[PDB]
Amino acid sequence: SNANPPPPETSNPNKPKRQTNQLQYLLRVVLKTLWKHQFAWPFQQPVDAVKLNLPDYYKIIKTPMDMGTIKKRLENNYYWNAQECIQDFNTMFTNCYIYNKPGDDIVLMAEALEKLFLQKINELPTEE
Numbered sequence: 200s201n202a203n204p205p206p207p208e209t210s211n212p213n214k215p216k217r218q219t220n221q222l223q224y225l226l227r228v229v230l231k232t233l234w235k236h237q238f239a240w241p242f243q244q245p246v247d248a249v250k251l252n253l254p255d256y257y258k259i260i261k262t263p264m265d266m267g268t269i270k271k272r273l274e275n276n277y278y279w280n281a282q283e284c285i286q287d288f289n290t291m292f293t294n295c296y297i298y299n300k301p302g303d304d305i306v307l308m309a310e311a312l313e314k315l316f317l318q319k320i321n322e323l324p325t326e327e
């Protein structure tokens with residue numbers, strides 16, 4: 200839809216790429232575990248503001264992010280470091296908290312994914 204923005208970048212041949220043990224941990228452990236969570240489905244693809252009748256969404260959220268985009272960035276090696284990927288997850292959670300009312304169902308769902316995310320990120324291995 201023309202009323203939805205293009206998705207966040209997932210392919211850019213000019214951007215340097217690098218595989219790190221931390222990035223492998225983010226795909227194998229963090230993304231894998233969050234993706235199967237009962238509350239993951241609203242976060243598995245960009246917010247479709249047209250379909251969901253949220254016409255102001257992209258007037259408020261200027262740095263959209265979702266796990267579908269993160270999954271593509273991890274599987275198609277878009278990142279140089281783990282911090283870029285962790286920032287994407289944090290952007291996804293923050294966008295949800297900014298747009299929605301505290302205590303809304305979608306906020307409780309993002310909070311459950313973030314609690315699981317924090318448990319996994321505290322165990323982030325050191326580089327090798």
Ligand SMILES: Cc1sc2c(c1Cc1ccccc1)COCc1nnc(C)n1-2
Pocket residue numbers: 241242246251253294295298299304305308
């Ligand atoms: C499919 C989506 S994606 C989404 C929402 C829905 C519908 C919905 C409603 C209640 C419970 C679960 C899902 C609803 O809140 C707006 C919003 N802000 N960030 C996100 C992600 N969303």
